Amino acid sequence: NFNVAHGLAWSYYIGYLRLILPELQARIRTYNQHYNNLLRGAVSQRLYILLPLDCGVPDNLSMADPNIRFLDKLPYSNSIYELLENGQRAGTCVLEYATPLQTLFAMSQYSQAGFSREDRLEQAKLFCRTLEDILADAPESQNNCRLIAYQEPASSFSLSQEVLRHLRQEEKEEVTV
Amino acid sequence: NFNVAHGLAWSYYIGYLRLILPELQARIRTYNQHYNNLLRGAVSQRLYILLPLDCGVPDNLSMADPNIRFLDKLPYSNSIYELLENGQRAGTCVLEYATPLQTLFAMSQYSQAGFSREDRLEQAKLFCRTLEDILADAPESQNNCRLIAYQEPASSFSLSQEVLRHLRQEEKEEVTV
């Protein structure tokens, strides 16, 4: 009852993730020949979904962290980003905000909804849980995407470092197991 | 709890209807000069949203009724249709299926969801109710759109006639009150 995030998660998966994920790792490998050749290093395999409990989705990622720099489009719109440490390329990554969080934010500012900041944060959390469950039971359409949920303090916080942790963990997984 | 339609309705309104409705009646009046001049008669003012409890959304409207014929695009994509009676133009109308019903249908065919035909029909109904409430409290972004919910028998049924009833009722309202 008034669990808006339940529908948001299902719709996001059914209407978007289920459609873009299967070919995802293929068109990344296709691209990876060239990234290997042109400035050695490869783009990670999973799709990284940013879920700020903020529900704060900026029009451009670099605006949320200067160390997250746009690099290239993946051959509808999918973007490859480099992540920086001291000006050095530390990682590369197809990276994306979960759009439905924008809906939770717009409801937050829509008065007739009776939807507060407190509700929004809780629905954001519910959104993550629910999507996580959905992906768990989803066939091979889960091992090609990682959810990155995070709450910013209010205040030092690095989103690049957060993504970087996930990227390095992924690589550790691939070579070990 | 597991009321997916709640989120679907809010998202549909916040992420789509709230954005396309305000200018809607303006760009229809703009078009109406020419429809007046070119083959007399005007396009109705409201946006007509089809909500088949079927959750059956065809790629093209005419496939669901031969008497519903595509006419023109409204100057993102908004389509003007003529409705036919015995080959005669009886009405003209910006006409659209509520997309979220497709999500309810895709969930219906997705086994890991545990979502049956019975659930789907109920969630479709919930979707209509909820959207109806939302539009009620919505500022001037309700008098420019009509919801057409309908259940097909299983079996004679005319969708054109259903739309036509609404169109004629609207006109009766405008001239009387």
Side-chain angles (χ1 to χ4, degrees):
Chain A
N1 55 96
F2 212 146
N3 284 311
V4 73
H6 203 249
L8 290 185
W10 275 106
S11 166
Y12 186 57
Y13 172 77
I14 288 292
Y16 174 71
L17 284 189
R18 191 155 169 246
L19 274 12
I20 214 151
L21 285 192
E23 49 176 31
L24 204 270
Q25 290 199 356
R27 45 200 282 259
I28 286 184
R29 291 186 200 93
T30 294
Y31 178 96
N32 259 339
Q33 276 85 60
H34 309 70
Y35 197 17
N36 176 42
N37 294 326
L38 310 166
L39 206 147
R40 304 277 171 184
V43 196
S44 153
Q45 308 279 335
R46 293 169 171 249
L47 175 62
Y48 289 87
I49 310 297
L50 303 172
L51 314 97
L53 306 183
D54 275 49
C55 298
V57 179
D59 300 274
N60 166 248
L61 257 161
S62 307
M63 309 293 108
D65 191 316
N67 290 322
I68 308 190
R69 160 89 184 89
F70 174 83
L71 176 67
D72 209 348
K73 282 287 275 83
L74 196 68
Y76 269 118
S77 161
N78 285 112
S79 307
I80 308 183
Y81 292 78
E82 54 181 354
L83 309 152
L84 298 180
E85 259 174 350
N86 315 120
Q88 318 279 14
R89 209 202 294 275
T92 312
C93 185
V94 186
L95 200 58
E96 225 168 76
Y97 279 102
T99 314
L101 298 183
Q102 280 179 298
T103 297
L104 290 186
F105 187 80
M107 282 183 61
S108 216
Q109 308 199 316
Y110 177 65
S111 63
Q112 302 78 336
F115 198 68
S116 72
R117 319 274 199 78
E118 144 211 52
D119 296 330
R120 190 225 288 147
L121 166 54
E122 186 55 63
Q123 289 302 308
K125 289 174 175 172
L126 181 51
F127 181 85
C128 306
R129 280 199 54 243
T130 309
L131 187 62
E132 199 182 358
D133 295 349
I134 295 169
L135 289 180
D137 306 340
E140 322 273 5
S141 284
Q142 126 91 316
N143 99 94
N144 23 24
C145 98
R146 196 88 151 277
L147 308 187
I148 300 164
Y150 58 92
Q151 198 172 335
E152 299 156 80
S155 306
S156 74
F157 171 82
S158 209
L159 212 195
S160 63
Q161 284 303 123
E162 193 62 27
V163 179
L164 251 10
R165 267 190 41 242
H166 277 91
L167 264 51
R168 292 176 175 135
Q169 178 61 39
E170 175 193 342
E171 179 181 21
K172 177 185 177 185
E173 287 169 358
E174 302 213 323
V175 299
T176 45
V177 52
Chain B
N1 55 96
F2 212 146
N3 284 311
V4 73
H6 203 249
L8 290 185
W10 275 106
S11 166
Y12 186 57
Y13 172 77
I14 288 292
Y16 174 71
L17 284 189
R18 191 155 169 246
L19 274 12
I20 214 151
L21 285 192
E23 49 176 31
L24 204 270
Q25 290 199 356
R27 45 200 282 259
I28 286 184
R29 291 186 200 93
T30 294
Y31 178 96
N32 259 339
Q33 276 85 60
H34 309 70
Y35 197 17
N36 176 42
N37 294 326
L38 310 166
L39 206 147
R40 304 277 171 184
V43 196
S44 153
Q45 308 279 335
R46 293 169 171 249
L47 175 62
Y48 289 87
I49 310 297
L50 303 172
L51 314 97
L53 306 183
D54 275 49
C55 298
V57 179
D59 300 274
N60 166 248
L61 257 161
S62 307
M63 309 293 108
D65 191 316
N67 290 322
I68 308 190
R69 160 89 184 89
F70 174 83
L71 176 67
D72 209 348
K73 282 287 275 83
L74 196 68
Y76 269 118
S77 161
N78 285 112
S79 307
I80 308 183
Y81 292 78
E82 54 181 354
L83 309 152
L84 298 180
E85 259 174 350
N86 315 120
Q88 318 279 14
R89 209 202 294 275
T92 312
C93 185
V94 186
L95 200 58
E96 225 168 76
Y97 279 102
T99 314
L101 298 183
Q102 280 179 298
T103 297
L104 290 186
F105 187 80
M107 282 183 61
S108 216
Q109 308 199 316
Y110 177 65
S111 63
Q112 302 78 336
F115 198 68
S116 72
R117 319 274 199 78
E118 144 211 52
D119 296 330
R120 190 225 288 147
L121 166 54
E122 186 55 63
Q123 289 302 308
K125 289 174 175 172
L126 181 51
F127 181 85
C128 306
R129 280 199 54 243
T130 309
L131 187 62
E132 199 182 358
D133 295 349
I134 295 169
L135 289 180
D137 306 340
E140 322 273 5
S141 284
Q142 126 91 316
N143 99 94
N144 23 24
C145 98
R146 196 88 151 277
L147 308 187
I148 300 164
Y150 58 92
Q151 198 172 335
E152 299 156 80
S155 306
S156 74
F157 171 82
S158 209
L159 212 195
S160 63
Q161 284 303 123
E162 193 62 27
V163 179
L164 251 10
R165 267 190 41 242
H166 277 91
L167 264 51
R168 292 176 175 135
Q169 178 61 39
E170 175 193 342
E171 179 181 21
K172 177 185 177 185
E173 287 169 358
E174 302 213 323
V175 299
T176 45
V177 52

